[PDB]
Structures are given as structure tokens and as C-alpha cells.
């Protein structure tokens, strides 16, 4: 036989620990660490997950070559979402020189989103931010003209796509279950929306964006090179990594601000003061806004949108006396690691001061403060994501005041899917400032 790695307790349901991973993934990953240590395992259906935690194990995880731990085929639930379509058999839109423009675009999207708010009212954070980020992502990554042809429908269907990521995907992403069925219908709904837009552009051409370019590409015969399914597949793929992440992070940032009015007041004074120089959001969102940035960092430590990072071992490796065999699913968890007691004093408390100049607990714990991951695969959209949070709230916090419309403890995440979403209701009251 072979040496067995430590295995966390429980996991006696039909698919081992899968059932528990769906109902309470963080509790399960935490128990793995509490019982096994830096290297423990749990069963996800027919796959064994080697969960790593702590600086040393995380370092190995984040510094391993794309040839040692494969990120491909690690997230089987994504295949049906992107589709088989192939256009060209992130980088561009994310170049620094483009940031200024995106910041201006984001400010515009926010103002348009709150345009009808009036003096006072209420909103649900998930509905608001999920939709807002569809508009920010599509406008910045695909084009403003394209976004102007999008409405709440695109948002709703994209949400359905994200919800079609049940852990059962590790059994088979095409299992005949409701969430997967809705997933497929939603994607077809998305393709139809794009097809309608394409037809509208054919009928009355511009007097141009990415869609216009793609629409104009043709094969020999003269027939259009790309179908609506292929283009949609690409657009979906381009917006996925930054949607649910920015959406959730935006909601939690506001939630923590309302939960901690002293930090909220600090941020307000800061914003009012900084923008007193008369420079635009496109200027300030790309520069230092310390109080808000520290609130964001702490929000990300406590509420990382990706609670688990997956890889597929392509060989045999040794991590702290433990053997990883090729074929094993190897994982790291920002959820668990970001709260390691030793690395972050009072890990369960919201303390943006951790990131202040003299403390910088984020830079000090290079292998455990991992909301954006680390190493070679560190989130490439990190700078954009931070800029977006800066731009969104520079507008929101200066225009309106926000208060929780439900118990502070009632705001929570839904972890029933691999793609974490804020749970509803998430009711918040707003009222114009000044
Ligand atoms: C503040 C919100 C965000 C958080 C917390 C976040 C977090 C992460 C994490 C933890 C990873 C690593 C996954 C792994 O190691 O397997 C990642 C990867 C990635 N993220 Fe984000 N992200 C955010 C926003 C965004 C945005 C807005 C974009 C696009 C504009 C984006 C694009 C990407 C891409 C393309 C990757 C893959 C990098 C690679 O493997 O080369 N992210 N992100
Ligand atoms: Fe509400």
C-alpha cells in the first residue's frame, strides 16, 4: 500500500465530505487544520483534497510551478460556463495606462446606477452590486457601447451562471440537477441577448468596440467567422474572474463600514479632504486613499471571495513530511489562512489598523494574508479591483449615507456553491448627505 495522509473526521455522507463542504466549507476546512495540522485531507466525492494551511505549506503551494500543481482541470464547474467555443485559438484591458480611463468609466457606471435613488430609500446589496459590477466589467473589459446595450437581464442570467457551480461539479458538471439545468438555460439566454445585439448592429451600423471587430471577421466564403455562441463564450470568460469577486467585496466593504461607524467616519473625512483638491475620481482612485484602502484590506482578510484555491498535482511532492501524489487535488484556503491566530492578532476582529505603516500585517505575512492569492498566480486583476473599490465608494460615500436595515449579524455569505455569493436579504438604507 502507501502511507495515508491525515484525514479530517466526519465525511460519512454519500459523497464523503462533499455534502459538508457545501453546507459549511469554512467549518470543514477549519476542522481539517485543527485536527490534522498544516497538511490534512477531506474527501470530495471520488477525489481526495490535500488541504494546506500555514505559512510553510502555503509557500510550497504558491511557489510551485504550473507543471507541479496544475490550475487547469482544477475547477471542473467552469467548463460548462465558458463553453467549448473558440475565438482566438484580461492582459490588454488591465494595462496600467488604461486604469485612468477605467476609473472614469466606473465612476460613470456608479452615478448611472444611483441616478434614480432620490433623497432616500433602500437597496439589497447583492442585487445592487451584482448588477453594478456587470456594468463596470462589461464597460471596462468589453466596451462602453456594448454595456449601453445591456440591462438587468444580462445581470440576472450571469448570476444564474455563477449559481450553477454546485460542488457536485466534482462528480460531473453535467449531472441532471436543477442548478446545472438553470446554468445551461441561463447561458443560452446570454447567447440570445448577444445575438440580438449583433443583429441590431448589422441593421444599423455605427456612425466601434470589440463586438464590432468580431462581427466583421469573416472566413473565405465570406460567411461570418464567429457565431453568437462563440462571442458570448468569450465575453462570459472575460468577465467571470472579476464579477462575483468585486461584487461580494463591494458588499462586504460597505457592510463592515456600517458595522464599524468609527472607521466609516474616518473614511468619510478622508474622502471629503482628499477630493477637496478638485481632482477627479480617475485621479484619486489610482492613488493613496489609506483609510478606505485599509478598510478594504481588512474586509478582504475576513471575507475573501475565494475561500479555497484548487490545483491538481502533476507529480509527487513532500510537504512537511507528508507525501502529495500526482492526481491529488491540492488546496489552500484564504478563508482559513487569513485568520491564523498567530499571524493575525485577534483574527476574528475587524482592525484596519493592521495595515497601517508601522504594522502592515498584509506585507509581513506574505504566505498567509492571501485574499488575492500569492506567488505566480496572484490575482492579475488585483490593482484593477482595488482601483474599482476606490472609485465606487469615492462616489457612493460622498453622495449618500448608509445604514443597515437588518441585524448586523444577519449579513452573511451563501456557501452552497463554489462561487460564493452574498446571501439575501441584504437590506440597507441610504439617504443623501449634506
Ligand atoms: C478584490 C476582488 C478580487 C479578489 C479577492 C480576487 C482574488 C483572486 C485569487 C485569490 C486568485 C487566485 C486563484 C488561484 O490561485 O487559483 C485570483 C486569480 C485571478 N483573478 Fe482575481 N480577484 C479579485 C478581482 C479580480 C478582477 C476584478 C479581475 C479582472 C479585472 C480578476 C482576475 C483574475 C484572473 C485573470 C486570475 C487568474 C490569474 C492566473 O492564474 O494567472 N480578479 N483572483
Ligand atoms: Fe431591502
Quick structural summary:
This protein is α+β, with helices and mostly antiparallel strands. Helix content is 47%, strand content 11%.
What does the secondary structure layout of this molecule look like, with pairings?
Blueprint: H1 18-23, H2 25-36, E1 39-44, E2 47-52, H3 55-63, E3 69-70, H4 78-82, H5 96-113, E4 120-124, H6 125-141, H7 144-147, H8 152-163, H9 178-203, H10 210-216, H11 228-259, H12 261-274, H13 281-284, H14 290-302, E5 309-313, E6 317-319, E7 322-324, E8 329-332, H15 334-337, H16 361-364, H17 382-399, E9 400-404, E10 413-414, E11 421-422, E12 427-432
Helix pairs in contact: 5-6, 5-17, 6-8, 6-11, 8-9, 9-11, 11-12, 11-14, 11-17, 12-14
Fe (ii) ion is lined by residues 122, 124, 405, 425, 427.
InterPro entries: CYP450_sterol_14alpha_dmase, Cyt_P450, Cyt_P450_CS, Cyt_P450_E_grp-IV, Cyt_P450_sf
Keywords: Cytoplasm, Heme, Iron, Lipid biosynthesis, Lipid metabolism, Metal-binding, Monooxygenase, Oxidoreductase, Steroid biosynthesis, Steroid metabolism, Sterol biosynthesis, Sterol metabolism
Subcellular location: Cytoplasm
Amino acid at each position: 500500500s502507501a502511507v495515508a495522509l491525515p484525514r479530517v473526521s466526519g465525511g460519512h455522507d454519500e459523497h464523503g465530505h462533499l455534502e459538508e463542504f457545501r453546507t459549511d466549507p469554512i467549518g470543514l476546512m477549519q476542522r481539517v487544520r485543527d485536527e490534522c495540522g498544516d497538511v490534512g485531507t477531506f474527501q470530495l466525492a471520488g477525489k481526495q483534497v490535500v488541504l494546506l494551511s500555514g505559512s510553510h505549506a502555503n509557500e510550497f503551494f504558491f511557489r510551485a510551478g504550473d507543471d507541479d500543481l496544475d490550475q487547469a482541470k482544477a475547477y471542473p464547474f467552469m467548463t460548462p460556463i465558458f463553453g467549448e467555443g473558440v475565438v482566438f485559438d484580461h492582459n490588454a484591458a488591465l494595462r496600467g495606462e488604461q486604469m485612468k480611463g477605467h476609473a472614469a468609466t466606473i465612476e460613470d457606471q456608479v452615478r448611472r446606477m444611483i441616478a434614480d435613488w432620490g433623497e432616500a430609500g433602500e437597496i439589497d446589496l447583492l442585487d445592487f452590486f451584482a448588477e453594478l459590477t456587470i456594468y463596470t466589467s462589461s464597460a471596462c473589459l468589453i466596451g462602453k457601447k456594448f454595456r449601453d446595450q445591456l440591462d438587468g437581464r444580462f445581470a440576472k442570467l450571469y448570476h444564474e451562471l455563477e449559481r450553477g457551480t454546485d460542488p457536485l461539479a466534482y462528480v460531473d458538471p453535467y449531472l441532471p440537477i436543477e442548478s446545472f439545468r438553470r446554468r445551461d438555460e441561463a447561458r443560452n439566454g446570454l447567447v440570445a441577448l448577444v445575438a440580438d445585439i449583433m443583429n441590431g448592429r448589422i441593421a444599423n451600423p455605427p456612425t466601434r468596440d470589440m463586438l464590432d471587430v468580431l462581427i466583421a471577421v469573416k472566413a473565405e466564403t465570406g460567411t461570418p467567422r464567429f457565431s453568437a455562441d462563440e462571442i458570448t463564450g468569450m465575453f462570459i470568460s472575460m468577465m467571470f474572474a472579476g464579477h462575483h469577486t468585486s461584487s461580494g467585496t463591494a458588499s462586504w466593504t460597505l457592510i463592515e463600514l456600517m458595522r464599524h461607524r468609527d472607521a466609516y467616519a474616518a473614511v468619510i473625512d478622508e474622502l471629503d479632504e482628499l477630493y477637496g483638491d478638485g481632482r477627479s475620481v480617475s485621479f484619486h482612485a489610482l492613488r493613496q486613499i489609506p483609510q478606505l484602502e485599509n478598510v478594504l484590506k481588512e474586509t478582504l482578510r475576513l471575507h475573501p471571495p475565494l475561500i479555497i484555491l484548487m490545483r491538481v498535482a502533476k507529480g509527487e511532492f513532500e510537504v512537511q513530511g507528508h507525501r502529495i501524489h500526482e492526481g491529488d487535488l491540492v488546496a489552500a484556503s484564504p478563508a482559513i489562512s487569513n485568520r491564523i491566530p498567530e499571524d493575525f492578532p485577534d483574527p476574528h476582529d475587524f482592525v484596519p489598523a493592521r495595515y497601517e505603516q508601522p504594522r502592515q500585517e498584509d506585507l509581513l505575512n506574505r504566505w498567509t494574508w492571501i485574499p488575492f492569492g500569492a506567488g505566480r498566480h496572484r490575482c492579475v486583476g488585483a490593482a484593477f479591483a482595488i482601483m474599482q473599490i476606490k472609485a465606487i465608494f469615492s462616489v457612493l460615500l460622498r453622495e449618500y449615507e448608509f445604514e443597515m436595515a437588518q441585524p448586523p449579524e444577519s449579513y452573511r455569505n451563501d456557501h452552497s456553491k463554489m462561487v460564493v455569493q452574498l446571501a439575501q436579504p441584504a437590506c440597507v438604507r441610504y439617504r443623501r448627505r449634506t
